[PDB]
Amino acid sequence: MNVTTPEVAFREYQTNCLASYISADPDITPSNLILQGYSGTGKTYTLKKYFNANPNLHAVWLEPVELVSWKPLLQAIARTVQYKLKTLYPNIPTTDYDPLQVEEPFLLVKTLHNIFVQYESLQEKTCLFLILDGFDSLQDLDAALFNKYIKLNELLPKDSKINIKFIYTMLETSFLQRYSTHCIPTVMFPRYNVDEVSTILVMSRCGELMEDSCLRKRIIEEQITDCTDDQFQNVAANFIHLIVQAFHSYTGNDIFALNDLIDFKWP
Amino acid sequence: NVRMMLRRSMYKLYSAADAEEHNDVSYDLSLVENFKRLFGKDLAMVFNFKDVDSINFNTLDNFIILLKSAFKYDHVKISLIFNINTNLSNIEKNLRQSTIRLLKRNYHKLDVSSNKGF
Amino acid sequence: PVIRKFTKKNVARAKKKYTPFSKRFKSIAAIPDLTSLPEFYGNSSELMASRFENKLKTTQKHQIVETIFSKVKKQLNSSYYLPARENEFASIYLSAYSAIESDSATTIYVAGTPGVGKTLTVREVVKELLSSSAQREIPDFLYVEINGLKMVKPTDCYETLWNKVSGERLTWAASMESLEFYFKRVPKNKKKTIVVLLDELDAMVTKSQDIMYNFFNWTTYENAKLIVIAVANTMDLPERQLGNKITSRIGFTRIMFTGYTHEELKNIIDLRLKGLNDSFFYVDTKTGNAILIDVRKVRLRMSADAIEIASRKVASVSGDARRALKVCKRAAEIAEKHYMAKHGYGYDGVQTVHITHVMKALNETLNSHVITFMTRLSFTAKLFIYALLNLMKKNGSQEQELGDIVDEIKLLIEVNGSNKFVMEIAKTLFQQGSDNISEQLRIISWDFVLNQLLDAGILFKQTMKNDRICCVKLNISVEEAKRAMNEDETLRNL
Amino acid sequence: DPGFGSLQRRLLQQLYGTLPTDEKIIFTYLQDCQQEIDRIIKQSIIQKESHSVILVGPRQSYKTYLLDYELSLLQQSYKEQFITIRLNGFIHSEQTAINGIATQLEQQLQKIHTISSGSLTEVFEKILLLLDSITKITVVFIFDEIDTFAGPVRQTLLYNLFDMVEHSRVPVCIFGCTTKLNILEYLEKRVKSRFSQRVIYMPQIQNLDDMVDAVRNLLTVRSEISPWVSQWNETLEKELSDPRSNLNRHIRMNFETFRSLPTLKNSIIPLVATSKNFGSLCTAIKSCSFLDIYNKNQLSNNLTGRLQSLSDLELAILISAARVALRAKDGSFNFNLAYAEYEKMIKAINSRINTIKLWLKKDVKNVWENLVQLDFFTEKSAVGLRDNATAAFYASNYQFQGTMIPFDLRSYQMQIILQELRRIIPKSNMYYSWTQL
Ligand SMILES: Nc1ncnc2c1ncn2[C@@H]1O[C@H](COP(=O)(O)OP(=O)(O)OP(=O)(O)O)[C@@H](O)[C@H]1O
Ligand SMILES: Nc1ncnc2c1ncn2[C@@H]1O[C@H](COP(=O)(O)OP(=O)(O)OP(=O)(O)O)[C@@H](O)[C@H]1O
Ligand SMILES: Nc1ncnc2c1ncn2[C@@H]1O[C@H](COP(=O)(O)OP(=O)(O)OP(=O)(O)O)[C@@H](O)[C@H]1O
Ligand SMILES: [Mg+2]
Ligand SMILES: [Mg+2]
Ligand SMILES: [Mg+2]
């Protein structure tokens, strides 16, 4: 299938991996897959970048970073599935079930089965994608969780005109090695290096801090009519070069703390 | 723990903002970001940790990390107040600096006592 | 306006009453006769029993295939006369007949190991008691089946007792009170004798035996007539759960059933087979269907010496007729499938089974596949268990950490820098031969095999976070570990 | 050509095992079990046997997949005879399992021609009466991870199912997939008495040629579609025959490291997945140099690369901790002890003689948590992640001494040891002279 590749600067390996993994037709996509990484690598940013590259495919988004346990995920999923279904199929009739009615994965699958049987009159089969950002970052997590979510596609009947898929993102990899016997496809993003993070920053924060107020503030506090966008960018670039040359030993290959410190000390 | 006081805050907010205008929704951080499409009005929260010093600091850190996850809706504001009793430098390093970095952004300081300036 | 702090909507409330029977007549003279009542004494459960018969009926037939052994399997099945265990019949039936003649409240308790035919014998005894009820000379009484394992909550015994003796629905706390009322406050002239069988009490009353305490309180009346029996495995239960005073004051009778003897086992199993024993069958030429007294007329038989040996081996351990019968059935199955494979009919003049195959079916139960599997693993698990045994020989500790066992592993590998097997499995295990791969402190697949052995049960891991100081134990033995070690040609020499 | 793309999809779905029920491939090294189990199932489907059986084998070994394959073989000629039941211990429980059973039984009985209503015990007795009490429709259960139903005390459902197998007239087929080997050990007297006790195991790979012919079969075409079908077949044959090929070496690697096929399936999928044109396909499967990148980036960030990417301050403080741990009894260390040893190291370095700068306590404060969050240190009497719900619940109720006492005086623990680091690091560093106690 024709898939527009996102011409990224540093994550083209994972771009190739995922563009080969996933396409419109569910037949050439794996039953379950993981996208693990580390903070600051922009794994989530690149996921939506690839979605921009491929508009026709769609997915739901959940952020259990705020949710605390399993049942809140159950209610959120039960809400979002039917919300997306009815929003993207306006003409289809429905008997909207209560998302709060879910209190257990058994009830969740029961209501999804009801949704599918009421959606039985589709013209072609369609598989959607689910996203759980920070599934290991939960606050009451235990070791008996991931396998159950892996087991969603099995209890579902095979005659479903509408199916689903799972996405994940971990940080530590300790719990990931705790469960790797099931041979799940996985794509990884190694922590960046000096030049990689430097380029990432000078192409990400460059505009953000170039259209900031303080530049124009100082340009007329000094009252000097000798300037150009090229020289603004050059001075910002060399100041960031100094910042990284000073505090790389402090942090290394991270972006969040550097951005916070820049916001604090730029003025 | 974290979830208990989260439920306290959600129950407070719901039972306070319901009767003022006249179905049930669970107690979670989804409710605050779903306030618009339930009541029609935006919301601004003010928080008051009564005894800031005698609480479990890892639980506090988990709670603040959880609350910093609702700044992506562009329709809500909030504010936190610590009613300190000892000092700022006494406890600003007792808690991990991960929380303290952003807390250096916009703060305010008051000299507080019953005998202010005689 | 109000908000419910927590909701319960999936609840399934049961439509049952709270008012006991004691509050719908309001006077002793205002009570009718329950015998002259259509709803009482279970005259309505028949419609429910017969209402669900047609839910699973169909009429699909296509090229039915029938064979020789299956009829014998059915003849040998447990779903059906016995003279082996008859003295207990003559005793307990005599006691029950005398008890019903006396119209008293007698108590009796029995036990036995699973497979002693206790349930079979009691069911046959009560069936012959049903026949004596068909004599129409003894006072009629109604049976009650009590299967707490098929029941969920132990207190539901009262609920079902009321719902089957009256058809009325209530909760335990009211049903048992109304039953107290129905028992001690009700005279004899119209109340009916009831016989009850309790089953496997060891798990009904795990908490405090309040339910059975209430039962044994019911079984101590002179104005109420009941026949109470129970089944268990242990024997000390009446004095253990209750104590000595209650069990002595009740003064019941005690008995237990023991495993049968080999001769009785063989006699009974052949008794379930005399109809087909040494029978002659007309057999077709294509399907091989065996029809009894293009067609043969052949004979059927089975190894009586195999009966002897099969009964002998298993009569000395437990006496489980279920075990004996399944052994016979599986011997028949293996013989039948081997015979079928001889010709290869497909799917759409002497026949006999041998001592060899009967013992083949009987012995694979005790032959454990664990030995073969653990000898058929990869080299890594065997090497690691051997290292564990080396540490056991070195310290006599009965326990070993993870860091210490890994140290022993590295020492055992590096000491043998000469052996050819370890030489040839050397470089393909850390960085996998080629460059561009940095070394790793641990080998590949160690966590894989560790979780494999954890999931196998031979390895025990305590709850700890440190990957080094976490204690580790082996579960089976050191001798069997050697019986796996030395069958590797390379391990024996090192 | 798009025909080659359709061929790519065809071989990808052959790799998965999602074909019609005539081309789904099974190999001679398991035809024994395949022809055993198809018979074992049809004997209950059409011959009305009530056999009870429990499969046994490790994860990723194609047990439930083979059950599904046999049932899909059966369906084409048997669209009415059987009813399918799929269950799982983790997804279900001792209470919701019966509700799922009732829902399934009611919602597929309509597919050919109430139950779900009532309370817990009420539905229990409904199902009990319906199953306990011309021709009968066969029922097949597919248990998954019966280890959950292998609890210590009650587990009454398994006893009820086996008693139903023995007593009922309907053919009650039971299949059990797990990972434990000795299952019968869990059981009590009753479960052993009721159960047939006949448990089947799975075969293992006994020779390299077995996996070679498995690869051949899984990479052989059985239909003429694309102009390169014969080319693919002959290339696979000729390349796989040669024992010198990198792919045969990786066959050996599977044989000796893991001894399980699905991980190899995962490893091979990306090759064709990223394959674009015929020339790149041929060269990449010839040199197999992209397997180098695959296995380089597969386990890249486990133990080594993470330590390869870090600041020299991290190395210095780690050395300070490691030396004092070796000096110590239990190897315990703290923040300021490591700081003291670090300053001693820098003092010696500047005494032996572009300059060197030491970083204050405030500077070490930020990076200490970066160390502890990268799985290099721990707490002395630590317990990391509880397995189950009750333990996770009590974790949040009772707090820790390490929680309440300040940052820099809680007892820590080490992951790597001095000599391990000494032999691991590049020895050319200026800090190499300071990696030996
Ligand atoms: N290749 C890239 N191109 C552009 N921006 C990038 C790239 N890699 C990383 N980034 C930046 O990295 C930032 C990382 O923030 P993000 O919210 O995506 O967190 P993360 O790495 O997914 O971590 P976590 O899931 O733990 O929050 C992204 O906002 C993006 O701006
Ligand atoms: N004398 C006998 N005659 C015929 N069959 C017998 C005899 N003794 C034992 N059996 C067989 O042995 C089986 C053992 O069943 P039994 O009545 O002992 O079960 P149980 O002890 O109630 O079972 P559980 O402990 O599982 O609840 C009987 O069903 C019957 O098939
Ligand atoms: N519908 C399917 N189509 C293709 N392949 C499948 C399908 N279902 C399962 N598989 C294959 O089954 C293989 C694993 O088999 P299976 O899940 O039965 O293993 P197992 O060891 O019995 O697991 P468990 O005990 O967890 O059920 C996986 O490699 C997957 O490719
Ligand atoms: Mg992120
Ligand atoms: Mg019994
Ligand atoms: Mg399985």
JSON list of N, CA, C and O and ligand atoms in Angstrom, two decimals, chain A residues 8-11 38-46 49 133 169 171 192 200 203-204 255-256, ligand 1:
[
{"chain": "A", "resi": 8, "resn": "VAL", "atom": "N", "xyz": [11.82, 12.27, 8.27]},
{"chain": "A", "resi": 8, "resn": "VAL", "atom": "CA", "xyz": [12.32, 12.77, 9.54]},
{"chain": "A", "resi": 8, "resn": "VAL", "atom": "C", "xyz": [13.84, 12.90, 9.45]},
{"chain": "A", "resi": 8, "resn": "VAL", "atom": "O", "xyz": [14.46, 12.33, 8.55]},
{"chain": "A", "resi": 9, "resn": "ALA", "atom": "N", "xyz": [14.43, 13.65, 10.37]},
{"chain": "A", "resi": 9, "resn": "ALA", "atom": "CA", "xyz": [15.86, 13.91, 10.33]},
{"chain": "A", "resi": 9, "resn": "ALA", "atom": "C", "xyz": [16.68, 12.82, 11.02]},
{"chain": "A", "resi": 9, "resn": "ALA", "atom": "O", "xyz": [17.84, 12.60, 10.65]},
{"chain": "A", "resi": 10, "resn": "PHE", "atom": "N", "xyz": [16.11, 12.15, 12.02]},
{"chain": "A", "resi": 10, "resn": "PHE", "atom": "CA", "xyz": [16.89, 11.24, 12.85]},
{"chain": "A", "resi": 10, "resn": "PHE", "atom": "C", "xyz": [16.22, 9.91, 13.15]},
{"chain": "A", "resi": 10, "resn": "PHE", "atom": "O", "xyz": [16.90, 9.01, 13.65]},
{"chain": "A", "resi": 11, "resn": "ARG", "atom": "N", "xyz": [14.93, 9.75, 12.87]},
{"chain": "A", "resi": 11, "resn": "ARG", "atom": "CA", "xyz": [14.20, 8.54, 13.25]},
{"chain": "A", "resi": 11, "resn": "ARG", "atom": "C", "xyz": [13.72, 7.78, 12.02]},
{"chain": "A", "resi": 11, "resn": "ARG", "atom": "O", "xyz": [12.69, 7.11, 12.06]},
{"chain": "A", "resi": 38, "resn": "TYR", "atom": "N", "xyz": [12.50, 6.23, 25.21]},
{"chain": "A", "resi": 38, "resn": "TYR", "atom": "CA", "xyz": [12.86, 6.99, 26.40]},
{"chain": "A", "resi": 38, "resn": "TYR", "atom": "C", "xyz": [12.34, 8.41, 26.28]},
{"chain": "A", "resi": 38, "resn": "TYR", "atom": "O", "xyz": [12.09, 8.92, 25.18]},
{"chain": "A", "resi": 39, "resn": "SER", "atom": "N", "xyz": [12.18, 9.05, 27.43]},
{"chain": "A", "resi": 39, "resn": "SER", "atom": "CA", "xyz": [11.68, 10.42, 27.47]},
{"chain": "A", "resi": 39, "resn": "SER", "atom": "C", "xyz": [12.60, 11.35, 26.70]},
{"chain": "A", "resi": 39, "resn": "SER", "atom": "O", "xyz": [13.82, 11.21, 26.71]},
{"chain": "A", "resi": 40, "resn": "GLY", "atom": "N", "xyz": [11.99, 12.32, 26.01]},
{"chain": "A", "resi": 40, "resn": "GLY", "atom": "CA", "xyz": [12.72, 13.28, 25.22]},
{"chain": "A", "resi": 40, "resn": "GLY", "atom": "C", "xyz": [12.96, 12.88, 23.78]},
{"chain": "A", "resi": 40, "resn": "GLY", "atom": "O", "xyz": [13.29, 13.75, 22.96]},
{"chain": "A", "resi": 41, "resn": "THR", "atom": "N", "xyz": [12.81, 11.60, 23.44]},
{"chain": "A", "resi": 41, "resn": "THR", "atom": "CA", "xyz": [13.04, 11.15, 22.07]},
{"chain": "A", "resi": 41, "resn": "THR", "atom": "C", "xyz": [11.89, 11.52, 21.14]},
{"chain": "A", "resi": 41, "resn": "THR", "atom": "O", "xyz": [12.01, 11.32, 19.93]},
{"chain": "A", "resi": 42, "resn": "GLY", "atom": "N", "xyz": [10.78, 12.03, 21.68]},
{"chain": "A", "resi": 42, "resn": "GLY", "atom": "CA", "xyz": [9.65, 12.37, 20.85]},
{"chain": "A", "resi": 42, "resn": "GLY", "atom": "C", "xyz": [9.01, 11.19, 20.16]},
{"chain": "A", "resi": 42, "resn": "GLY", "atom": "O", "xyz": [8.62, 11.30, 19.00]},
{"chain": "A", "resi": 43, "resn": "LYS", "atom": "N", "xyz": [8.90, 10.05, 20.85]},
{"chain": "A", "resi": 43, "resn": "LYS", "atom": "CA", "xyz": [8.20, 8.91, 20.28]},
{"chain": "A", "resi": 43, "resn": "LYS", "atom": "C", "xyz": [6.74, 9.26, 20.00]},
{"chain": "A", "resi": 43, "resn": "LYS", "atom": "O", "xyz": [6.21, 8.96, 18.92]},
{"chain": "A", "resi": 44, "resn": "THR", "atom": "N", "xyz": [6.08, 9.90, 20.96]},
{"chain": "A", "resi": 44, "resn": "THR", "atom": "CA", "xyz": [4.71, 10.35, 20.75]},
{"chain": "A", "resi": 44, "resn": "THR", "atom": "C", "xyz": [4.62, 11.39, 19.64]},
{"chain": "A", "resi": 44, "resn": "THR", "atom": "O", "xyz": [3.69, 11.34, 18.82]},
{"chain": "A", "resi": 45, "resn": "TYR", "atom": "N", "xyz": [5.57, 12.32, 19.59]},
{"chain": "A", "resi": 45, "resn": "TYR", "atom": "CA", "xyz": [5.58, 13.32, 18.53]},
{"chain": "A", "resi": 45, "resn": "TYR", "atom": "C", "xyz": [5.69, 12.67, 17.16]},
{"chain": "A", "resi": 45, "resn": "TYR", "atom": "O", "xyz": [4.96, 13.02, 16.23]},
{"chain": "A", "resi": 46, "resn": "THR", "atom": "N", "xyz": [6.59, 11.69, 17.02]},
{"chain": "A", "resi": 46, "resn": "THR", "atom": "CA", "xyz": [6.76, 11.00, 15.75]},
{"chain": "A", "resi": 46, "resn": "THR", "atom": "C", "xyz": [5.57, 10.12, 15.40]},
{"chain": "A", "resi": 46, "resn": "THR", "atom": "O", "xyz": [5.29, 9.93, 14.22]},
{"chain": "A", "resi": 49, "resn": "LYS", "atom": "N", "xyz": [3.35, 12.50, 13.89]},
{"chain": "A", "resi": 49, "resn": "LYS", "atom": "CA", "xyz": [3.97, 12.89, 12.63]},
{"chain": "A", "resi": 49, "resn": "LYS", "atom": "C", "xyz": [3.68, 11.88, 11.54]},
{"chain": "A", "resi": 49, "resn": "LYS", "atom": "O", "xyz": [3.31, 12.25, 10.41]},
{"chain": "A", "resi": 133, "resn": "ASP", "atom": "N", "xyz": [-0.61, 5.90, 26.17]},
{"chain": "A", "resi": 133, "resn": "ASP", "atom": "CA", "xyz": [0.67, 6.57, 26.36]},
{"chain": "A", "resi": 133, "resn": "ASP", "atom": "C", "xyz": [1.08, 6.46, 27.82]},
{"chain": "A", "resi": 133, "resn": "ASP", "atom": "O", "xyz": [0.37, 6.93, 28.71]},
{"chain": "A", "resi": 169, "resn": "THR", "atom": "N", "xyz": [3.98, 2.30, 24.99]},
{"chain": "A", "resi": 169, "resn": "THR", "atom": "CA", "xyz": [5.19, 3.10, 25.15]},
{"chain": "A", "resi": 169, "resn": "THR", "atom": "C", "xyz": [5.69, 2.92, 26.57]},
{"chain": "A", "resi": 169, "resn": "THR", "atom": "O", "xyz": [4.98, 3.25, 27.52]},
{"chain": "A", "resi": 171, "resn": "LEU", "atom": "N", "xyz": [9.37, 3.09, 29.34]},
{"chain": "A", "resi": 171, "resn": "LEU", "atom": "CA", "xyz": [10.57, 3.88, 29.62]},
{"chain": "A", "resi": 171, "resn": "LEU", "atom": "C", "xyz": [11.68, 2.99, 30.16]},
{"chain": "A", "resi": 171, "resn": "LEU", "atom": "O", "xyz": [12.80, 3.05, 29.64]},
{"chain": "A", "resi": 192, "resn": "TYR", "atom": "N", "xyz": [19.53, 10.03, 22.33]},
{"chain": "A", "resi": 192, "resn": "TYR", "atom": "CA", "xyz": [20.25, 10.78, 21.32]},
{"chain": "A", "resi": 192, "resn": "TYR", "atom": "C", "xyz": [21.67, 11.09, 21.79]},
{"chain": "A", "resi": 192, "resn": "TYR", "atom": "O", "xyz": [22.07, 10.76, 22.91]},
{"chain": "A", "resi": 200, "resn": "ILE", "atom": "N", "xyz": [18.25, 18.67, 16.89]},
{"chain": "A", "resi": 200, "resn": "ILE", "atom": "CA", "xyz": [16.85, 18.59, 17.30]},
{"chain": "A", "resi": 200, "resn": "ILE", "atom": "C", "xyz": [16.41, 19.91, 17.91]},
{"chain": "A", "resi": 200, "resn": "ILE", "atom": "O", "xyz": [15.37, 20.46, 17.55]},
{"chain": "A", "resi": 203, "resn": "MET", "atom": "N", "xyz": [16.28, 22.95, 15.50]},
{"chain": "A", "resi": 203, "resn": "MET", "atom": "CA", "xyz": [15.15, 22.95, 14.57]},
{"chain": "A", "resi": 203, "resn": "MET", "atom": "C", "xyz": [13.80, 22.93, 15.26]},
{"chain": "A", "resi": 203, "resn": "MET", "atom": "O", "xyz": [12.78, 23.19, 14.60]},
{"chain": "A", "resi": 204, "resn": "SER", "atom": "N", "xyz": [13.75, 22.64, 16.56]},
{"chain": "A", "resi": 204, "resn": "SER", "atom": "CA", "xyz": [12.48, 22.64, 17.29]},
{"chain": "A", "resi": 204, "resn": "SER", "atom": "C", "xyz": [12.24, 23.97, 18.00]},
{"chain": "A", "resi": 204, "resn": "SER", "atom": "O", "xyz": [11.24, 24.65, 17.74]},
{"chain": "A", "resi": 255, "resn": "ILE", "atom": "N", "xyz": [16.33, 16.97, 26.60]},
{"chain": "A", "resi": 255, "resn": "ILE", "atom": "CA", "xyz": [15.81, 18.21, 26.02]},
{"chain": "A", "resi": 255, "resn": "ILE", "atom": "C", "xyz": [14.94, 18.96, 27.02]},
{"chain": "A", "resi": 255, "resn": "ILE", "atom": "O", "xyz": [14.94, 20.19, 27.04]},
{"chain": "A", "resi": 256, "resn": "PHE", "atom": "N", "xyz": [14.16, 18.23, 27.83]},
{"chain": "A", "resi": 256, "resn": "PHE", "atom": "CA", "xyz": [13.18, 18.88, 28.69]},
{"chain": "A", "resi": 256, "resn": "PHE", "atom": "C", "xyz": [13.84, 19.84, 29.68]},
{"chain": "A", "resi": 256, "resn": "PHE", "atom": "O", "xyz": [13.46, 21.01, 29.79]},
{"chain": "E", "resi": 1, "resn": "LIG", "atom": "N1", "xyz": [13.08, 13.56, 15.49]},
{"chain": "E", "resi": 1, "resn": "LIG", "atom": "C1", "xyz": [12.49, 14.56, 16.14]},
{"chain": "E", "resi": 1, "resn": "LIG", "atom": "N2", "xyz": [12.03, 15.61, 15.43]},
{"chain": "E", "resi": 1, "resn": "LIG", "atom": "C2", "xyz": [11.44, 16.62, 16.08]},
{"chain": "E", "resi": 1, "resn": "LIG", "atom": "N3", "xyz": [11.22, 16.76, 17.39]},
{"chain": "E", "resi": 1, "resn": "LIG", "atom": "C3", "xyz": [11.69, 15.71, 18.07]},
{"chain": "E", "resi": 1, "resn": "LIG", "atom": "C4", "xyz": [12.32, 14.60, 17.54]},
{"chain": "E", "resi": 1, "resn": "LIG", "atom": "N4", "xyz": [12.68, 13.71, 18.55]},
{"chain": "E", "resi": 1, "resn": "LIG", "atom": "C5", "xyz": [12.25, 14.30, 19.64]},
{"chain": "E", "resi": 1, "resn": "LIG", "atom": "N5", "xyz": [11.65, 15.51, 19.43]},
{"chain": "E", "resi": 1, "resn": "LIG", "atom": "C6", "xyz": [11.08, 16.39, 20.44]},
{"chain": "E", "resi": 1, "resn": "LIG", "atom": "O1", "xyz": [11.13, 15.67, 21.65]},
{"chain": "E", "resi": 1, "resn": "LIG", "atom": "C7", "xyz": [10.02, 16.10, 22.46]},
{"chain": "E", "resi": 1, "resn": "LIG", "atom": "C8", "xyz": [9.78, 15.00, 23.45]},
{"chain": "E", "resi": 1, "resn": "LIG", "atom": "O2", "xyz": [8.51, 15.22, 24.10]},
{"chain": "E", "resi": 1, "resn": "LIG", "atom": "P1", "xyz": [7.39, 14.10, 24.13]},
{"chain": "E", "resi": 1, "resn": "LIG", "atom": "O3", "xyz": [6.15, 14.68, 24.80]},
{"chain": "E", "resi": 1, "resn": "LIG", "atom": "O4", "xyz": [7.15, 13.55, 22.78]},
{"chain": "E", "resi": 1, "resn": "LIG", "atom": "O5", "xyz": [7.98, 13.01, 25.11]},
{"chain": "E", "resi": 1, "resn": "LIG", "atom": "P2", "xyz": [8.53, 11.52, 24.99]},
{"chain": "E", "resi": 1, "resn": "LIG", "atom": "O6", "xyz": [9.89, 11.46, 24.43]},
{"chain": "E", "resi": 1, "resn": "LIG", "atom": "O7", "xyz": [7.47, 10.72, 24.23]},
{"chain": "E", "resi": 1, "resn": "LIG", "atom": "O8", "xyz": [8.48, 11.03, 26.50]},
{"chain": "E", "resi": 1, "resn": "LIG", "atom": "P3", "xyz": [7.42, 10.50, 27.58]},
{"chain": "E", "resi": 1, "resn": "LIG", "atom": "O9", "xyz": [6.54, 9.51, 26.80]},
{"chain": "E", "resi": 1, "resn": "LIG", "atom": "O10", "xyz": [8.12, 9.89, 28.74]},
{"chain": "E", "resi": 1, "resn": "LIG", "atom": "O11", "xyz": [6.59, 11.73, 27.94]},
{"chain": "E", "resi": 1, "resn": "LIG", "atom": "C9", "xyz": [8.89, 16.15, 21.44]},
{"chain": "E", "resi": 1, "resn": "LIG", "atom": "O12", "xyz": [8.05, 17.22, 21.87]},
{"chain": "E", "resi": 1, "resn": "LIG", "atom": "C10", "xyz": [9.60, 16.66, 20.17]},
{"chain": "E", "resi": 1, "resn": "LIG", "atom": "O13", "xyz": [9.50, 18.08, 20.19]}
]
